[PDB]
Design a binder for this molecule. Structure first.
Ligand SMILES: Cc1ncc(COP(=O)(O)O)c(CN[C@@H](CC(C)C)C(=O)O)c1O
Ligand SMILES: Cc1ncc(COP(=O)(O)O)c(CN[C@@H](CC(C)C)C(=O)O)c1O
Lengths: 393, 395
């Protein structure tokens, strides 16, 4: 009886085939606009080094030992104070990608309806796809989800939850404005629906102020149905894998129960280190994050405006890390990617961001990682690839 | 008015057991001496060397350490694991604890109603991970010499489990040690039927005798059989709180684990992997020898104490490695009830029930001698003896 792997795997093995995540993470003179990797010039290496050594010397017996599933209590407290909730309503997760996996586990079943935008974040699609749901979509544009399309969906289908990224959506960069957020909240409250609000880019706004979150608006309305995800990845360090979920206790409790068997607890040194880094100077750190991303976005748009012919369209984000690019109808972003690689530049083709397919002429560009000169040079290389693609028609 | 209970899916009903989160916050009750969680001896933690190493990593390589990193793990760590275990680097996946490896295995191999084979009892974390997928648990008893192979033969004549989950070396929770001939017989049974084994080797290095037994993975590799997925961890030998472990498998299986890991957490934190690699680059053998000495001495301290304080109606194992003593009360007596009395005497342990996937074992309990110094072991056992005497006096 020779062993067959294909025959020994379960259904889960046939739902995890997309490889965008590992392909974006994989470790020469290629300039990357691919993964949403935060600017390394913002990492506080020296402060981190001091703080990590102090933790390990003075509290190493706690930091290196098994620790609570719910998270380091001072970090839960810091998060609660920042977000505006009780500490017991905060779960520390091993990145918000883990919170998405936990959400999928708690809420989805084979064939269960779930709603997100087309496009939306590939990580969330991948986490949810594991459970074998039926994906329902609405379009995403410059002002967020198409609420008219959503109204029609909700007449016929009750999603297990709605997954949204109101602030600088991955991958479009779209910003759901305040009146739309209120309308959306009304639509959800009228049917007692659950919303998973992913606020990874919360603090990366380019204007004067952050918009109220769906969670904030819900809290004001007395409505308990928003599960709120945030992360320290975009504002401090993605490699530490420290993030959080905030919810009504009944929901949060299920997330904590799921977390036990996922990894026991998020590494304790990491939580301690985030807390030590942010307990002073957080406001100021966030202001500097905004100034850097504003400047890189400006450089990206200047470079694109210079190098990209008008037959190719792209968004002009008001925050976050991404530009979203649309090629002429029927042109292949995958084909372009192969040409870009020969020109020593990378991006993410758009296909993985569309849960039910389509989008093969779209692509996402991240300006977060490179400095302004590498942005300018990377876009010059992209422009050459685009020009090659268009010239073949 | 929103209804949470109606909003959840089936998974919300399969995650109710709270043993894990309960064991992990016992620290919040510092006056209680713990024989509960398998928390490693903190006197072994290399705090100073770790502080120095972490600071050097963040100053010299902080742009790698603090950035998004490969799903498969830090390459020098993969290589280090590959050299230690005896495989190619590309056959290693770094995981956020072996608990995550368990969750990944469940994801890849189990569906609702699918059969899975494990012992009764077995590790509650594995039970918890697998239960999420809604499987049918098949069991065989576990004893001093590991799984009951005659019982296993009967199971395998009737069913093809998606995998067999075993812990051949110092099983959680019994401390059982599967001897070499039983390992070969198990291997033969699985090879003849083309089944998969998940071999959890958390306690690999914690042997009290002269040498480590061959793993089922090593035996399978010698026989040319690709069906063993091998799990190991740095938790019991270096630091559990860092959450760094590994899965080793044939590339076809390993690839599905890597695929699953993407959407679980993107990647295991990179500083943690670097730190583990830096700490183990030199002196690993000597570290391991020290681990063995310490747990050998704590096991001896525990048995000495039990032998003086525990009434002879109560049975307990005498482990040859690992972290645990497995205790069985007279039939019908409640480990849970004993636990409540133990809490009143300021000692904790883990009742046996969570370790039995299909129920049972309500008279059994696990004791961990890993965490306390010898004086705390002696005092905790005096406190446990008082609880036990109170339990037995009520009859
Ligand atoms: C919208 C959104 N939500 C969550 C995540 C996950 O981030 P953490 O787990 O670090 O908190 C993200 C991250 N996005 C990048 C992931 C790559 C694998 C690097 C990306 O390039 O999309 C997110 O955008
Ligand atoms: C047999 C066995 N396999 C895996 C694990 C998980 O450990 P890591 O994820 O740290 O690698 C364990 C650990 N066991 C303890 C867990 C408690 C929550 C602390 C235990 O008390 O059982 C294991 O024993």
């Amino acid at each position: 009886k020779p062993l067959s792997w294909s025959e020994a795997f379960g259904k889960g093995a046939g739902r995890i085939q997309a490889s965008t995540i590992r392909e974006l993470l994989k470790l020469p003179g290629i300039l990357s606009f691919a993964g949403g990797l935060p600017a390394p010039e913002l990492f506080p290496k020296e402060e981190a080094a001091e703080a990590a050594a102090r933790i390990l010397r003075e509290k190493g017996e706690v930091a290196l030992q098994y620790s609570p599933t719910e998270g380091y209590a001072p970090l839960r407290a810091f998060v609660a104070e920042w977000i505006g909730v009780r500490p017991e309503e905060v779960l520390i997760t091993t990145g918000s990608q883990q919170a998405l996996d936990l959400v999928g586990k708690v809420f989805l079943d084979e064939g269960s309806p779930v709603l997100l935008e087309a496009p939306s974040y590939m990580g969330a699609i991948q986490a949810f796809r594991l459970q074998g749901p039926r994906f329902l979509t609405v379009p995403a544009g410059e002002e967020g989800p198409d609420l008219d399309a959503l109204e029609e969906v909700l007449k016929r289908e009750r999603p297990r939850f709605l997954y949204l990224i109101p602030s600088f959506q991955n991958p479009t960069g779209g910003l759901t404005p305040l009146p739309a957020r209120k309308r959306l909240l009304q639509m959800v409250m009228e049917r007692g629906l659950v919303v998973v609000e992913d606020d990874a880019y919360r603090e990366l706004y380019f204007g004067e102020a952050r918009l109220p979150s769906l969670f904030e608006l819900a809290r004001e309305a007395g409505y308990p149905g928003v599960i709120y995800l945030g992360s320290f990845s975009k504002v401090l360090s993605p490699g530490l894998r420290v993030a959080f979920a905030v919810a009504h206790p009944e929901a949060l409790q299920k997330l904590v129960q799921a977390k036990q068997g996922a990894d026991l607890h998020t590494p304790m040194l990491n939580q301690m280190l985030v807390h030590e880094l942010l307990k002073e100077g957080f406001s100021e750190r966030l202001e500097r994050v905004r100034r850097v991303y504003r400047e890189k976005a400006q450089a990206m748009l200047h470079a694109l405006d210079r190098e990209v012919p008008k037959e190719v369209r792209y968004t002009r984000p008001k925050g976050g890390m991404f530009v979203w690019m649309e090629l002429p109808k029927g042109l292949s972003a995958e084909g372009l990617f192969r040409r870009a690689l020969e020109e020593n530049v990378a991006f993410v083709p758009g296909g993985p961001f569309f849960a039910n397919g389509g989008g093969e002429n779209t692509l996402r560009l991240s300006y977060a990682t490179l400095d302004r000169e590498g942005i300018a040079e990377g876009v010059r290389r992209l422009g050459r690839a685009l020009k090659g693609l268009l010239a073949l028609v």
